[PDB]
Amino acid sequence: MDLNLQDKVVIVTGGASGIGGAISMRLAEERAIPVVFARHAPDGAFLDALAQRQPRATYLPVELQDDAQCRDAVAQTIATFGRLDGLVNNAGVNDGIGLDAGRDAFVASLERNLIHYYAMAHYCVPHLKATRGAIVNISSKTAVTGQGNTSGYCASKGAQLALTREWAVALREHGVRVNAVIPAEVMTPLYDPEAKLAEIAAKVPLGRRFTTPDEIADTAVFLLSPRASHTTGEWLFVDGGYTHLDRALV
Amino acid sequence: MDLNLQDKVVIVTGGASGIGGAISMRLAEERAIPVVFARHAPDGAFLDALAQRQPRATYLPVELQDDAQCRDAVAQTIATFGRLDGLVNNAGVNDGIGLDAGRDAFVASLERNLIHYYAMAHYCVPHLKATRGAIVNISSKTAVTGQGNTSGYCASKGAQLALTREWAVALREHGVRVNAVIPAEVMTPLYRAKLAEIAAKVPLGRRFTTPDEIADTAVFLLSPRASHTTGEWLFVDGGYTHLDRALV
Amino acid sequence: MDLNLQDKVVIVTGGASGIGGAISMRLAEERAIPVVFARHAPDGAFLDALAQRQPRATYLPVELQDDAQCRDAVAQTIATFGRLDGLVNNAGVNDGIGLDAGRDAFVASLERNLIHYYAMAHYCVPHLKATRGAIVNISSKTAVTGQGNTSGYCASKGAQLALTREWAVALREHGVRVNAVIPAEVMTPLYRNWIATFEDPEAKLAEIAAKVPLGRRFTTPDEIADTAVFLLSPRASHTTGEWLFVDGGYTHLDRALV
Amino acid sequence: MDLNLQDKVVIVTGGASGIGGAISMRLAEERAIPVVFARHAPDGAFLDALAQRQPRATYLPVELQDDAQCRDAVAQTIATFGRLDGLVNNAGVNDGIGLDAGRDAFVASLERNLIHYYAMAHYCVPHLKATRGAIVNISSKTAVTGQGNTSGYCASKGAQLALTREWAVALREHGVRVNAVIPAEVMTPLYRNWIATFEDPEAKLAEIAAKVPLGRRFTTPDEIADTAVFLLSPRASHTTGEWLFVDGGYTHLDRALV
Ligand SMILES: NC(=O)c1ccc[n+]([C@@H]2O[C@H](COP(=O)([O-])OP(=O)(O)OC[C@H]3O[C@@H](n4cnc5c(N)ncnc54)[C@H](O)[C@@H]3O)[C@@H](O)[C@H]2O)c1
Ligand SMILES: NC(=O)c1ccc[n+]([C@@H]2O[C@H](COP(=O)([O-])OP(=O)(O)OC[C@H]3O[C@@H](n4cnc5c(N)ncnc54)[C@H](O)[C@@H]3O)[C@@H](O)[C@H]2O)c1
Ligand SMILES: NC(=O)c1ccc[n+]([C@@H]2O[C@H](COP(=O)([O-])OP(=O)(O)OC[C@H]3O[C@@H](n4cnc5c(N)ncnc54)[C@H](O)[C@@H]3O)[C@@H](O)[C@H]2O)c1
Ligand SMILES: NC(=O)c1ccc[n+]([C@@H]2O[C@H](COP(=O)([O-])OP(=O)(O)OC[C@H]3O[C@@H](n4cnc5c(N)ncnc54)[C@H](O)[C@@H]3O)[C@@H](O)[C@H]2O)c1
Ligand SMILES: [Cl-]
Ligand SMILES: [Cl-]
Ligand SMILES: [Cl-]
Ligand SMILES: [Cl-]
């Protein structure tokens, strides 16, 4: 299935590891041009594999919590490529800020997760309008399931789903589609460890195993493509049945 | 139906007008004790009607964006009544902060809407655990429908639905239930041809929902008649969110 | 809270046992007039308690899978009361018809669950219009969660949620509201006996209850009834088309929690 | 994006017209082998275009309401190809059976829509297990939004969403995924052969399209098809039980927007 993403310039925040890394790599495979926005320089092995698929793929060091860096990196991206066709908002961290943490910790969690999704959309949208590009927001099942000690992250991830609907409405007349992907348990390098891994994996209905970053990536990249040309405002759960299937199943 | 809220102490933020005021008034009618947290003093006719139903009902001047006023007003409430049985997070404003507004405006919207729901829960939860009380978060249909130029408010309202699920999980073993009510179109102070256009789109009766309708579901959710309902989002919207957009 | 249900006539299908019995009893307590449609004659103690609260409450023997009996029982209710204010579609059974069972078993499950919800609404709605009455459909979390070997019941319960939206649209101009209640695990004497067919009943019950997030306990029929009766009342006068989950967090809270 | 569907055998019910036809054509483009089950012989031009992409693509005449024809058609497909990799349940018709129509009309609507999705899955699933294949159920936004005079179709389309969750649970250990696609307004020549009946056919088309948030236009069959075929493929290898709305924002975006 040709996705028609060849030479499409797509910013992927947190795009050099885990889910974001897999999204960048699939974009490169589809001959798109992923532009990684991340705090830390990607590892060599990642850059080797990416450039092999797409020699023009790039990385920009960006602290997403700095509004001016977001602005300048988008500008640099436009200066380098002349256009922007996609935005994948993906950077985030479950920082475990619960009910007892207080205002400052809560707001800091919003900064780490929610606020830069808005800032990136804010700076990218004029460019996306010009190309009738697309946005994918990566959220989390916690936005709808809760978890128990992570108000900050949960609030952020839920706000991102709401913003997906809001931006889909806001941008409809410009042909800019906005969708979300909702993962549940995804194995990354990052993420008695023999036992606790087994414990978590056991709860995923399809195959009792973690979702892979590639699985999230394939749905995310489909959503950026014109193969999803009448899909906007949607939240796609890629979670092995985690959110919606009977909690009682083994 | 006896809701068993008699002498139960419930804080209602933005509780002196619009939906909040209707919630406070219904609480008083059920012989609960509403404690109004609001920026401005309620008008006299409101306070008099409230006192008629519940002489122990109380108003505290609170700017909810001030974390210290939140903390101090809760402390006051506990000092006065010795208990807290409910929190209704209700204060908010659709401030029309869109994609072009920028970071500062977006964050100011979060402060006006989202952040004080968390601050209030933060300060109330220890006391709610003591009484196996309840929380009701008032959200907005915009959280799931979008609207077009209100990123700030939409984000906030959606985060409030998420937090309803999170806090329901967090507090399950303490017997504290957390639910949300989602209104669509409710005629309230500043809301009042442009009228008819909006009303016409509400499937049930082609009319606005009333504050009393929102209040009746919110108060039901605060009560032990909803003793196994937690984490839920109750739409009270005349069909606005879920019924065919094509209907007339 | 006054639900304003005094002398309101409400048919409750399967209304003498479990969830349905609790709804009938709650209706009587709110001074409504419940009309029980059920296959089996109710307990004497149930009838005594019902009459104690509402002397006008009635019971009619009805096999709901018989369309003519639905028709005639609604007709008799109208003859007795002259009006109908509510319908609670509640009768049903999880009959464990899997994907391997085949057409005949699947259709039989639809007859036991889905088809009489439609039949009852078909015969009741013309009367509900005159009174601006209401319908509550009792569904099941299985409609959205699945279960694994119950295609017939799952299909039925999901169709009941869809029909809740459909009828809400269809009846909007008549002021007739239609909503659904979705239970998960509700302890009833019937469930209690099914659990008794297991080797270690105590352990089976605990195993089921352990999965309910709020309190690790079954929902009670009264808990389902209180929401259902609230939804029948004008206290829910702008709620229509809705699916209310009364389930201790079963459907929507993190599967990973203990 | 390689979908890895080359030489995979996929039955598509109603697969020679509208959405079903687009699904078959996309399957053939991906070098899969679509097998069309439909009541009428397909257009010659359709058969030619299909054959150009996939010479092995087949059509079997099937009345899906006849359980034995479903059974035999699946058996013939296994006899021809020796495997089954996918099932797209797609055939259906909005027959406008309201609340007032009664039992016989309602049940007939279930037969036209719901019951053959079950029958087809019943006969296909034993084979899908061996290949760790997949099912896509095509539903309708009406399952969740209602419409107003179509209880039979609404109930059917909603049962199909519920069965998607149920079969996803049932088949999880066999690695068979089950998902649904929910369209809203899709232009098919047949929809056009219904719109044709109106006094001002283009003004009617316009009234409908004006309600679709994204572009104020109908979704195309290819747009539905591309999501459906993605769901059949291992690119969606951890997606199961899901309902994917492909509807230009119809179901979920603010009704107030123009
Ligand atoms: N991994 C899971 O199980 C899981 C589950 C649900 C949702 N998600 C979502 O997936 C998305 C990706 O997570 P992942 O697990 O791949 O994460 P990851 O931590 O493995 O990678 C995230 C990347 O983003 C970068 N990053 C984070 N914050 C940043 C900032 N402020 N500025 C610049 N760079 C920043 C990190 O350095 C890292 O490179 C997140 O939005 C997460 O919430 C993940
Ligand atoms: N009116 C509607 O149609 C509608 C629709 C959807 C959701 N809602 C929700 O209902 C809730 C109540 O809104 P409303 O329509 O009744 O507005 P209402 O303004 O007329 O009253 C809200 C009250 O909250 C107070 N308030 C607001 N911000 C405050 C702050 N920072 N500190 C202290 N007090 C503050 C206001 O002074 C006012 O008294 C809100 O959460 C809103 O999102 C309303
Ligand atoms: N108990 C639970 O855990 C649970 C969970 C989810 C949903 N539900 C739903 O609650 C509703 C009631 O269930 P319950 O658990 O109370 O069951 P129950 O069996 O205790 O009571 C059902 C009543 O309906 C009557 N009935 C059944 N079929 C009938 C027919 N064809 N004609 C006449 N009467 C008939 C039965 O005889 C019985 O009196 C059902 O719709 C069920 O699907 C129950
Ligand atoms: N067209 C829309 O706007 C729309 C909207 C929502 C959902 N859908 C869904 O999409 C699916 C396809 O609809 P479509 O619009 O492409 O339909 P269509 O009418 O254009 O084609 C349906 C095909 O299925 C065949 N078919 C129907 N019943 C059959 C039977 N009993 N036995 C054998 N073959 C049979 C028909 O002959 C026809 O060839 C249906 O499930 C429908 O509910 C369509
Ligand atoms: Cl991977
Ligand atoms: Cl009012
Ligand atoms: Cl009880
Ligand atoms: Cl097409």
PDB file of N, CA and C in Angstrom, chain A residues 118 159 162-167 169-171, chain B residues 92-101 105-106 109-110 112-113 140-158, chain D residues 254:
ATOM      1  N   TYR A 118       0.946  21.568  22.597  1.00  0.00           N
ATOM      2  CA  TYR A 118       0.298  22.789  22.123  1.00  0.00           C
ATOM      3  C   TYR A 118       1.301  23.721  21.447  1.00  0.00           C
ATOM      4  N   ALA A 159      -5.829  15.602  28.145  1.00  0.00           N
ATOM      5  CA  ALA A 159      -5.878  16.879  27.450  1.00  0.00           C
ATOM      6  C   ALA A 159      -5.438  16.719  25.990  1.00  0.00           C
ATOM      7  N   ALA A 162      -8.318  15.437  24.011  1.00  0.00           N
ATOM      8  CA  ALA A 162      -9.276  16.517  23.802  1.00  0.00           C
ATOM      9  C   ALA A 162      -8.778  17.482  22.721  1.00  0.00           C
ATOM     10  N   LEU A 163      -7.491  17.818  22.758  1.00  0.00           N
ATOM     11  CA  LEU A 163      -6.908  18.709  21.755  1.00  0.00           C
ATOM     12  C   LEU A 163      -6.959  18.103  20.356  1.00  0.00           C
ATOM     13  N   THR A 164      -6.951  16.776  20.284  1.00  0.00           N
ATOM     14  CA  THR A 164      -7.068  16.092  19.001  1.00  0.00           C
ATOM     15  C   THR A 164      -8.426  16.411  18.366  1.00  0.00           C
ATOM     16  N   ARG A 165      -9.482  16.357  19.170  1.00  0.00           N
ATOM     17  CA  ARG A 165     -10.811  16.727  18.686  1.00  0.00           C
ATOM     18  C   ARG A 165     -10.882  18.208  18.355  1.00  0.00           C
ATOM     19  N   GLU A 166     -10.343  19.032  19.241  1.00  0.00           N
ATOM     20  CA  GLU A 166     -10.373  20.481  19.044  1.00  0.00           C
ATOM     21  C   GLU A 166      -9.642  20.911  17.781  1.00  0.00           C
ATOM     22  N   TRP A 167      -8.428  20.402  17.585  1.00  0.00           N
ATOM     23  CA  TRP A 167      -7.672  20.784  16.394  1.00  0.00           C
ATOM     24  C   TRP A 167      -8.275  20.216  15.119  1.00  0.00           C
ATOM     25  N   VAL A 169     -11.410  19.949  14.520  1.00  0.00           N
ATOM     26  CA  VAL A 169     -12.445  20.938  14.210  1.00  0.00           C
ATOM     27  C   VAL A 169     -11.842  22.237  13.678  1.00  0.00           C
ATOM     28  N   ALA A 170     -10.842  22.750  14.387  1.00  0.00           N
ATOM     29  CA  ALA A 170     -10.246  24.038  14.053  1.00  0.00           C
ATOM     30  C   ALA A 170      -9.657  24.053  12.649  1.00  0.00           C
ATOM     31  N   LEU A 171      -9.102  22.927  12.218  1.00  0.00           N
ATOM     32  CA  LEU A 171      -8.314  22.897  10.984  1.00  0.00           C
ATOM     33  C   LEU A 171      -9.043  22.249   9.809  1.00  0.00           C
TER      34      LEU A 171
ATOM     35  N   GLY B  92     -15.062  27.697  36.123  1.00  0.00           N
ATOM     36  CA  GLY B  92     -14.404  27.645  34.831  1.00  0.00           C
ATOM     37  C   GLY B  92     -14.889  28.741  33.906  1.00  0.00           C
ATOM     38  N   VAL B  93     -14.207  28.903  32.778  1.00  0.00           N
ATOM     39  CA  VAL B  93     -14.601  29.880  31.770  1.00  0.00           C
ATOM     40  C   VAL B  93     -14.055  29.460  30.415  1.00  0.00           C
ATOM     41  N   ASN B  94     -14.918  29.449  29.407  1.00  0.00           N
ATOM     42  CA  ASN B  94     -14.473  29.218  28.038  1.00  0.00           C
ATOM     43  C   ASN B  94     -13.858  30.508  27.513  1.00  0.00           C
ATOM     44  N   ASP B  95     -12.534  30.603  27.603  1.00  0.00           N
ATOM     45  CA  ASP B  95     -11.832  31.846  27.303  1.00  0.00           C
ATOM     46  C   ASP B  95     -11.339  31.989  25.861  1.00  0.00           C
ATOM     47  N   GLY B  96     -11.727  31.055  24.991  1.00  0.00           N
ATOM     48  CA  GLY B  96     -11.484  31.189  23.561  1.00  0.00           C
ATOM     49  C   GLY B  96     -10.028  31.346  23.169  1.00  0.00           C
ATOM     50  N   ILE B  97      -9.166  30.557  23.801  1.00  0.00           N
ATOM     51  CA  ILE B  97      -7.735  30.580  23.515  1.00  0.00           C
ATOM     52  C   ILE B  97      -7.412  29.510  22.475  1.00  0.00           C
ATOM     53  N   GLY B  98      -7.192  29.931  21.229  1.00  0.00           N
ATOM     54  CA  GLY B  98      -7.011  29.007  20.119  1.00  0.00           C
ATOM     55  C   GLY B  98      -5.564  28.673  19.791  1.00  0.00           C
ATOM     56  N   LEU B  99      -5.356  28.093  18.611  1.00  0.00           N
ATOM     57  CA  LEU B  99      -4.035  27.649  18.166  1.00  0.00           C
ATOM     58  C   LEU B  99      -3.037  28.781  17.961  1.00  0.00           C
ATOM     59  N   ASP B 100      -3.538  29.976  17.666  1.00  0.00           N
ATOM     60  CA  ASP B 100      -2.653  31.098  17.377  1.00  0.00           C
ATOM     61  C   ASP B 100      -2.292  31.912  18.621  1.00  0.00           C
ATOM     62  N   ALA B 101      -2.981  31.662  19.730  1.00  0.00           N
ATOM     63  CA  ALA B 101      -2.814  32.486  20.935  1.00  0.00           C
ATOM     64  C   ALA B 101      -1.413  32.424  21.546  1.00  0.00           C
ATOM     65  N   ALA B 105      -0.907  32.470  26.877  1.00  0.00           N
ATOM     66  CA  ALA B 105      -2.362  32.464  26.874  1.00  0.00           C
ATOM     67  C   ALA B 105      -2.919  31.062  27.129  1.00  0.00           C
ATOM     68  N   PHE B 106      -2.288  30.048  26.540  1.00  0.00           N
ATOM     69  CA  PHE B 106      -2.712  28.661  26.737  1.00  0.00           C
ATOM     70  C   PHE B 106      -2.591  28.270  28.205  1.00  0.00           C
ATOM     71  N   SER B 109      -5.098  29.778  30.457  1.00  0.00           N
ATOM     72  CA  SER B 109      -6.363  29.053  30.349  1.00  0.00           C
ATOM     73  C   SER B 109      -6.349  27.826  31.259  1.00  0.00           C
ATOM     74  N   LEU B 110      -5.242  27.083  31.256  1.00  0.00           N
ATOM     75  CA  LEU B 110      -5.083  25.953  32.175  1.00  0.00           C
ATOM     76  C   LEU B 110      -5.226  26.394  33.633  1.00  0.00           C
ATOM     77  N   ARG B 112      -6.971  28.929  34.711  1.00  0.00           N
ATOM     78  CA  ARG B 112      -8.352  29.344  34.931  1.00  0.00           C
ATOM     79  C   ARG B 112      -9.314  28.174  35.024  1.00  0.00           C
ATOM     80  N   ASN B 113      -8.902  27.019  34.510  1.00  0.00           N
ATOM     81  CA  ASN B 113      -9.814  25.886  34.398  1.00  0.00           C
ATOM     82  C   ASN B 113      -9.312  24.590  35.044  1.00  0.00           C
ATOM     83  N   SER B 140     -17.215  19.599  30.250  1.00  0.00           N
ATOM     84  CA  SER B 140     -17.915  20.263  29.144  1.00  0.00           C
ATOM     85  C   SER B 140     -17.914  19.337  27.959  1.00  0.00           C
ATOM     86  N   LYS B 141     -18.954  19.404  27.131  1.00  0.00           N
ATOM     87  CA  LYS B 141     -19.003  18.546  25.954  1.00  0.00           C
ATOM     88  C   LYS B 141     -17.829  18.849  25.017  1.00  0.00           C
ATOM     89  N   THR B 142     -17.316  20.074  25.086  1.00  0.00           N
ATOM     90  CA  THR B 142     -16.176  20.476  24.257  1.00  0.00           C
ATOM     91  C   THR B 142     -14.948  19.573  24.462  1.00  0.00           C
ATOM     92  N   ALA B 143     -14.863  18.959  25.641  1.00  0.00           N
ATOM     93  CA  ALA B 143     -13.772  18.035  25.963  1.00  0.00           C
ATOM     94  C   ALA B 143     -13.720  16.871  24.983  1.00  0.00           C
ATOM     95  N   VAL B 144     -14.882  16.478  24.477  1.00  0.00           N
ATOM     96  CA  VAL B 144     -14.920  15.384  23.516  1.00  0.00           C
ATOM     97  C   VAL B 144     -15.378  15.802  22.114  1.00  0.00           C
ATOM     98  N   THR B 145     -16.081  16.927  21.979  1.00  0.00           N
ATOM     99  CA  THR B 145     -16.547  17.343  20.647  1.00  0.00           C
ATOM    100  C   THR B 145     -15.609  18.326  19.938  1.00  0.00           C
ATOM    101  N   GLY B 146     -14.741  18.983  20.703  1.00  0.00           N
ATOM    102  CA  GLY B 146     -14.011  20.132  20.184  1.00  0.00           C
ATOM    103  C   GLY B 146     -14.975  21.288  19.947  1.00  0.00           C
ATOM    104  N   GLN B 147     -14.469  22.416  19.457  1.00  0.00           N
ATOM    105  CA  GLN B 147     -15.327  23.577  19.193  1.00  0.00           C
ATOM    106  C   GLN B 147     -14.752  24.488  18.116  1.00  0.00           C
ATOM    107  N   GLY B 148     -13.439  24.711  18.154  1.00  0.00           N
ATOM    108  CA  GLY B 148     -12.782  25.368  17.036  1.00  0.00           C
ATOM    109  C   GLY B 148     -11.783  26.463  17.350  1.00  0.00           C
ATOM    110  N   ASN B 149     -11.964  27.154  18.470  1.00  0.00           N
ATOM    111  CA  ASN B 149     -11.016  28.203  18.846  1.00  0.00           C
ATOM    112  C   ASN B 149     -10.840  28.286  20.357  1.00  0.00           C
ATOM    113  N   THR B 150     -10.656  27.137  20.989  1.00  0.00           N
ATOM    114  CA  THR B 150     -10.630  27.105  22.445  1.00  0.00           C
ATOM    115  C   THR B 150      -9.750  25.938  22.934  1.00  0.00           C
ATOM    116  N   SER B 151      -8.544  25.855  22.372  1.00  0.00           N
ATOM    117  CA  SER B 151      -7.541  24.883  22.809  1.00  0.00           C
ATOM    118  C   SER B 151      -7.369  24.873  24.325  1.00  0.00           C
ATOM    119  N   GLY B 152      -7.265  26.053  24.927  1.00  0.00           N
ATOM    120  CA  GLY B 152      -7.018  26.147  26.357  1.00  0.00           C
ATOM    121  C   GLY B 152      -8.099  25.476  27.187  1.00  0.00           C
ATOM    122  N   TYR B 153      -9.349  25.846  26.914  1.00  0.00           N
ATOM    123  CA  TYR B 153     -10.510  25.332  27.630  1.00  0.00           C
ATOM    124  C   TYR B 153     -10.756  23.868  27.306  1.00  0.00           C
ATOM    125  N   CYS B 154     -10.619  23.510  26.037  1.00  0.00           N
ATOM    126  CA  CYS B 154     -10.816  22.125  25.626  1.00  0.00           C
ATOM    127  C   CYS B 154      -9.824  21.190  26.329  1.00  0.00           C
ATOM    128  N   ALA B 155      -8.543  21.541  26.262  1.00  0.00           N
ATOM    129  CA  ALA B 155      -7.495  20.792  26.963  1.00  0.00           C
ATOM    130  C   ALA B 155      -7.838  20.628  28.440  1.00  0.00           C
ATOM    131  N   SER B 156      -8.229  21.724  29.082  1.00  0.00           N
ATOM    132  CA  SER B 156      -8.579  21.697  30.505  1.00  0.00           C
ATOM    133  C   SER B 156      -9.742  20.747  30.769  1.00  0.00           C
ATOM    134  N   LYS B 157     -10.804  20.891  29.992  1.00  0.00           N
ATOM    135  CA  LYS B 157     -12.001  20.098  30.214  1.00  0.00           C
ATOM    136  C   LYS B 157     -11.752  18.616  29.973  1.00  0.00           C
ATOM    137  N   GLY B 158     -10.894  18.310  29.005  1.00  0.00           N
ATOM    138  CA  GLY B 158     -10.540  16.932  28.717  1.00  0.00           C
ATOM    139  C   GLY B 158      -9.665  16.356  29.819  1.00  0.00           C
TER     140      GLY B 158
ATOM    141  N   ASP D 254     -18.179  18.346  17.132  1.00  0.00           N
ATOM    142  CA  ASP D 254     -19.279  19.243  17.506  1.00  0.00           C
ATOM    143  C   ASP D 254     -20.378  19.354  16.450  1.00  0.00           C
TER     144      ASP D 254
END
